[PDB]
């Protein structure tokens, strides 16, 4: 509604001042949709109201709004979340605020930050939790917050410069990362002191804290990768972070192996942008550059990592099939998504084609979750998701990789010969699933001919 309306509120002053009046009557309301629609309205004002009529009439006013949003930040979790998600969009649309905006979140973080080294659990995690009457709840999603920070800050360094907050934040995240490397779950009081009992208030708290921890780690992974021109110490740090992350995930598998499988909260979506994941696989499979390769040979080693960082692309495309949108930055600018889907397709074709399953050296346990298989699974889901949503850009799709059809046929034949080889090879324990979804892929592809 307000996406439609607002071009009125460029002109009118009375309606503007009545809208904002209602938005500030709503943030202090009991029903939940009041808070959230109040934030939403606010951000949309903040967006289109000016880029920087008289600019002096707007800057003060938006600052007034953001002084108001420091209230909502004192309110329940999702209301904070919605901010954190929207602020990247704000800054891409309205650059001039950066010096203020960072501080709004910086101070929000500073209730948790502990800027004394030789203190190992380097954040306050009992500030992000609320217990009353034995009702135990999250407040302050710190993970999404850090995500917001990372994204805004990288974008800042990227475009804004071509001023002390960010020159600090560099060393802030550095110290946080180093402290994060060598905090080993007993500064967090995890795994043995607690047993993630979904019954007990304490095991509940543990569950929640752990999710937060893993989210934090994921963001820091994105940051460490982004910083360098592929310097090796940061990549070792990324591996160690991931090793703690996976340690937490398999702790939960131990804890989610016992109870019935209605804890589908483990698959809580990653805080990695589609963009970064595209760039990561691009750099894993189609990078032969010696100057970088010494670092990539480190990640390329740790297979578990390599399959983490595919399962992601699966969760992202699966978000694109269930909903029209994804979580991250530029998670609704569909051309961005179409770019990132093309630039996943490209790499997975490279991998799947060049290197089949029959070169495997892992054995029976990883043969149920082998990597090339998952490249293909994503390919099936991409092809399905595109034909659903991005119909008219299918010629654009393929020039990536003459009509629709020659492109289509050349793609088909690779799977065709692959399955033929698959059948002709054996009958004992032929890979049911691989076949099944090769066929499914071809099924999808058919519907362009």
């Amino acid at each position: 509604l307000l996406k439609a309306v607002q071009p009125l509120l460029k002109v009118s002053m009375s309606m503007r001042d009545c809208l904002i009046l209602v938005l500030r009557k709503a943030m202090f309301a009991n029903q939940l949709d009041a808070r959230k629609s109040a934030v939403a309205g606010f951000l949309l004002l903040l967006k289109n109201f000016k880029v920087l009529y008289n600019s002096v009439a707007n800057e003060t006013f938006c600052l007034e709004i953001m002084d108001s949003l420091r209230r909502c930040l004192s309110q329940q979790a999702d209301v904070r979340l919605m901010l954190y998600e929207g602020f990247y969009d704000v800054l891409r649309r309205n650059s001039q605020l950066a010096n203020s905006v960072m501080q709004t979140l910086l101070s929000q973080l500073k209730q948790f930050y502990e800027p004394e080294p030789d203190l190992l659990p380097p954040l306050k995690l009992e500030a992000c939790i609320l217990t009353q009457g034995d009702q135990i709840s999250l407040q302050e999603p710190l993970d999404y917050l850090l995500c917001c920070i990372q994204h805004c800050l990288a974008w800042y360094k990227n475009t804004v410069i071509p001023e002390a907050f960010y020159e600090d934040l560099d060393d802030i995240l550095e110290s946080i990362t180093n402290r994060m490397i060598k905090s080993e779950l007993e500064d967090f009081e995890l795994d043995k002191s607690a047993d993630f009992s979904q019954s007990t208030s304490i095991g509940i708290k543990n569950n929640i804290s752990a999710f937060l921890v893993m989210g934090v780690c994921e963001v820091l992974i994105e940051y460490n990768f982004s910083i360098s021109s592929f310097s090796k110490n940061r990549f070792e740090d990324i591996l160690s972070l991931f090793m703690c992350y996976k340690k937490l995930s398999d702790i939960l598998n131990e804890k989610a192996g016992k109870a019935k499988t209605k804890m589908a909260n483990k698959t809580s979506d990653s805080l990695l942008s589609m963009k970064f994941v595209s760039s990561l696989l691009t750099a894993l499979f189609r990078d032969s550059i010696q100057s970088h390769q010494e670092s990539l040979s480190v990640l390329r080693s740790s297979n578990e990592f390599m399959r983490y960082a595919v399962n992601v692309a699966l969760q992202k495309v699966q978000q694109l099939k269930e909903t029209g949108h994804v979580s991250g930055p530029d998670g609704q600018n569909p051309e961005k998504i179409f770019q990132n889907l093309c630039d996943l397709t490209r790499v997975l074709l490279w991998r799947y084609t060049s290197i089949p399953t029959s070169v495997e050296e892992s054995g029976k346990k990883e043969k149920g979750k082998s990597i090339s298989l998952l490249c293909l699974e994503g390919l099936q889901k991409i092809f399905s998701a595109v034909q659903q949503f991005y119909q008219p850009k299918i010629q654009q799709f393929l020039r990536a990789l003459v009509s629709v059809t020659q492109r289509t046929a050349f793609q088909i034949r690779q799977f065709q010969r692959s399955l033929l080889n698959l059948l002709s090879s054996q009958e004992e324990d032929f890979n049911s699933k691989e076949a099944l979804l090769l066929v499914t892929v071809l099924t999808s592809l058919s519907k362009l001919l």
Binding site: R24, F28, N30, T60, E64, R71, S74, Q75, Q76, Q132
Partner: protein, 407 residues
């Protein structure tokens, strides 16, 4: 002269004598951050705040100077928020300011509406409204509830009606309990508690407790209080206590013992009903089906039909369930004239607005067979035309000649 007024003058605000609204030389946030950063960069940053508060409290010892410190600031670039609220957004002065603000006010509980009919207690609570930040709730929570406990009836009632904008998610639930201690304390004070508590985040269990503490005291009440009570009740219900509470309510009520404050406050009751029926279909469908299930007893009363008309007008979507319920209802020797008589004889101002609602019902009735149907739809026109405006009458006859030329 003092560090207080001098740093005011530095920060871009003028302190005048106490005759006129104070001024401001810059934007509001410019002034606020200049004050904040100037005290920070000033050495002994902790203890300069003591000199600040001492200078201020020594200045506002005069009634009019105090009032002008509280009055709106005059903008050049032409009105804004007051000086004291522009200090109240400042988090570092905030606790000391709130302390001293709560401190001296009991000199004024008899010196109310001093000069220009301004409730200085209402001025000082109106400093604490739409606070975009609160730094310590529980000190304020203790202070506010005790200061309410000491206060007189009218003033503390005004304070009660102004709390929830002040309060945070840190301090709702606990004050929910203390307000029930106030609920029990006086029968004079029961209703603005319900206003507040309705407007708060509170658990459904304490909410259900106080809901029963209301529902036992339904028929023991005057009319004046009921719409704000009922509004609270309309957003106190669960999804599962809906049929039970509608039945409880509907069987419990009078609407006739109250029967020009009566018809006015019943219109407000019905406006409260209009606000709650519109979207909360878990109550509207609950209501429809709570009355269709009491189609056995023909002793179901005005309120059952008033609700039929209001909800038929209200929801485009649930029209036909109402349609079918009434076509079965009418057939049983239930809904009859005498109900319609008193309905339109007293409850006309509510349905005065809902002319075309009635007329659509009538039109939909007269189409079918079962002359009971047709009889009742005609009686509808008669009484509707009788007690309503000349516009309504014009509309009726238009509709009638339409049914004539057409059907």
């Amino acid at each position: 002269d003092s560090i207080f007024v001098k740093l005011l003058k530095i920060s871009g605000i003028i302190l005048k004598t106490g005759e006129s609204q104070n001024q401001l030389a810059v934007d509001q946030i410019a002034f606020q951050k200049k004050l904040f950063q100037t005290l920070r960069r000033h050495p002994s940053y902790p203890k300069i705040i003591e000199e600040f508060v001492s200078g201020l409290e020594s200045y506002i010892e005069d009634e009019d100077s105090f009032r002008n410190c509280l009055l709106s600031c005059e903008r050049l670039q032409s009105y804004s928020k007051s000086l004291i609220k522009l200090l109240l957004g400042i988090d570092i002065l905030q606790p000391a300011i709130i302390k001293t603000l709560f401190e001296k006010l009991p000199e004024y509980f008899f010196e109310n509406k001093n000069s220009d009919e301004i409730n200085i207690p209402r001025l000082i609570v109106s400093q604490l409204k739409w606070l975009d930040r609160v730094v310590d709730g529980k000190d304020l929570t203790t202070k506010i509830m005790q200061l309410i406990s000491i206060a007189p009836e009218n003033l503390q009632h005004d304070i009660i009606t102004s709390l929830p904008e002040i309060l945070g998610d840190s301090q709702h639930a606990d004050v929910g309990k203390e307000l029930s201690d106030l609920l029990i304390e006086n029968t004079s004070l029961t209703v603005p508690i319900l206003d507040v508590l309705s407007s708060l985040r509170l658990d459904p269990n304490f909410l259900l407790k106080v809901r029963q503490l209301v529902m036992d005291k339904l028929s023991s009440i005057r009319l004046e209080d009921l719409p704000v009570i009922i509004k609270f009740i309309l957003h106190s219900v669960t999804a599962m206590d809906t049929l039970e509470v509608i039945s409880e309510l509907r069987e419990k009520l009078d609407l006739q013992h109250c029967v020009s404050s009566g018809q006015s406050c019943i219109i407000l009751l019905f406006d409260v009903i209009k606000s709650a029926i519109r979207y909360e279909k878990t109550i509207s469908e609950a209501w429809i089906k709570a009355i269709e299930n009491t189609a056995s007893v023909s002793e179901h009363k005005v309120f059952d039909l008033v609700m039929l008309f209001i909800i038929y007008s209200t929801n485009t979507q649930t029209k036909k369930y109402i349609d079918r319920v009434l076509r079965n209802k009418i057939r049983s020797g239930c809904i009859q004239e005498q109900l319609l008589q008193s309905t339109f004889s007293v409850h006309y101002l509510v349905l005065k607005d809902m002319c075309s609602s009635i007329l659509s019902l009538a039109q939909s009735l007269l189409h079918s067979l079962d002359q009971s149907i047709i009889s009742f739809g005609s009686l509808l026109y008669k009484y509707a035309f009788k007690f309503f405006d000349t516009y309504c009458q014009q509309e009726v006859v238009g509709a009638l000649v339409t049914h004539i030329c057409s059907g």
